[PDB]
Amino acid sequence: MPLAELGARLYREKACFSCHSIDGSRLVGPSFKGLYGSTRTFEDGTTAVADENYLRESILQPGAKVVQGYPNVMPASYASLSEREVAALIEFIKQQQ
Ligand code: HEC
């Protein structure tokens, strides 16, 4: 199955939808709309661009860098996602623009 399609399925099955919208609305977490390639500011005032590595780090190392003005509640369980699943989720995120 193509990665974007698997990533849409994982967005649902892995519960991302519960905290992250794809229509620009703020839920518990930030929307994925426009996320890839945007600049992020963290709780410490540092910034970074949301590139592939940042998305990967955000999913696989939850809680390591936290977007300012959000609670630090990314699930632990995603540290166990497989390489295909991470790649799929990222492909799905990149196309939310
Ligand atoms: C609520 C209990 C969450 C669930 C379920 C998922 N995420 Fe999350 N995420 C959440 C918050 C509150 C935040 C912001 C604080 C922080 O840790 O930075 C995030 C952040 C991310 C990011 C970075 C987003 C940005 O705007 O820079 C990514 C890429 C991300 N989250 C991905 C993600 C995926 C793919 C999830 C399902 C596997 C998922 N999150 C679930 C809260 C919650």
Q: Please report, as a single letter, which amino acid is at residue 96.
A: Q
Distances (CA, A) of 70 to 30, 65, 67, 92, 95: 8, 11, 6, 22, 23
Q: How was this structure determined?
A: X-ray
Q: Which two tokens stand for residue 52?
A: 């592939």
Q: Which of 58, 85, 96, 97 is the best mutation target for the ligand 1 pocket, counting ligand atoms within 8 Å of the beta carbon and taking the most?
A: 58
Q: How far is the CA of 1 from the centre of ligand 1 (A)?
A: 24
Q: How far is the CA of 72 from the centre of ligand 1 (A)?
A: 9
Pair 44, 69: CB distance under 8 Å: no
Pair 19, 97: CB distance under 8 Å: no
Q: How far is the CA of 39 from the centre of ligand 1 (A)?
A: 15
| Declared resolution, Å | 1.3
Say how far apart CA 25 and CA 96 lie, in whole Å.
13
Nearest to 17 by CA among 2, 28, 5, 6: 28
CB-count exposure of residue 20 (10 Å: 0-12, 13-18, 19+): buried
Say how far apart CA 53 and CA 59 lie, in whole Å.
10
Domains of the chain, each with CATH number or no CATH: 1-97 (1.10.760.10)
Say how far apart CA 54 and CA 35 lie, in whole Å.
11
